[PDB]
Write a protein that binds this ligand. Structure first.
Ligand SMILES: O=C(O)c1ccccc1NC[C@H](O)[C@H](O)[C@H](O)COP(=O)(O)O
Length: 194
């Protein structure tokens, strides 16, 4: 069964609702220019109140390795999602202390060729024509499918690719920073086949 991550959480109530509905991970965007931005302190409060067995991920965009490590131990993250243009070295350094997921934007097979350079880490493909990923699926360990996913389309995207996980943030929102519980229920209901 596919895993589901709900990203850009900015408040407790949305996070908890996510957990109770079946979400396997919850994410916080530590990129200052995002509308879904949340401060380490506010994130800490949420992190700390969540049950175990639910991953806490932090999204960073071209941040310097030390800041990544500090936010991570402070907020008690379980993984780090490197969503910029980070070189494998930075990736490899971060990975010595905590698990990293590398995000890579994709729109044509040239992009999939760039992604293969990071195949040693789990990949989040930020994408749509799912089938163009197919000839590359087995070159990767674990693949997180993302981009434009919503309750209406997740199942189709899951049938074509069969990924480890699926990620979403605006496709289940009422507005930037605030989730819509019915959409979350439906997104998880549909993606997992419950
Ligand atoms: O959500 C944001 O604003 C944001 C900004 C900068 C970096 C990452 C961000 N989101 C983190 C996560 O990887 C995103 O959910 C997906 O790329 C967005 O999928 P969407 O729901 O917009 O299709």
């Amino acid at each position: 069964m596919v895993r589901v991550k709900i990203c850009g959480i900015t408040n407790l109530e949305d996070a908890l609702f996510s957990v109770e509905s079946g979400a396997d991970a919850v994410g916080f965007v530590f990129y200052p220019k995002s509308k879904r931005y949340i401060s380490p302190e506010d994130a800490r409060r949420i992190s700390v109140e969540l049950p175990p067995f639910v991953f806490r991920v932090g999204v960073f965009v071209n941040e310097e390795p030390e800041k990544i490590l500090d936010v991570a131990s402070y907020v008690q993250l379980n993984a780090v999602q490197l969503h910029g243009e980070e070189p494998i070295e930075l990736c490899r350094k971060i990975a010595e202390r905590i698990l990293v997921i590398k995000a890579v934007g994709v729109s044509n097979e040239r992009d999939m060729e760039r992604a293969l350079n990071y195949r040693e880490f789990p990949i989040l493909l930020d994408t749509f024509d799912w089938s163009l990923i197919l000839p590359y699926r087995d070159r990767f360990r674990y693949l997180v499918l993302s981009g434009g996913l919503n309750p209406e389309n997740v199942r189709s995207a899951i049938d074509v690719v069969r990924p480890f996980a699926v990620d979403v943030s605006s496709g289940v929102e009422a507005f930037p920073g605030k989730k819509d519980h019915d959409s979350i229920k439906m997104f998880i209901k549909n993606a997992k086949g419950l």
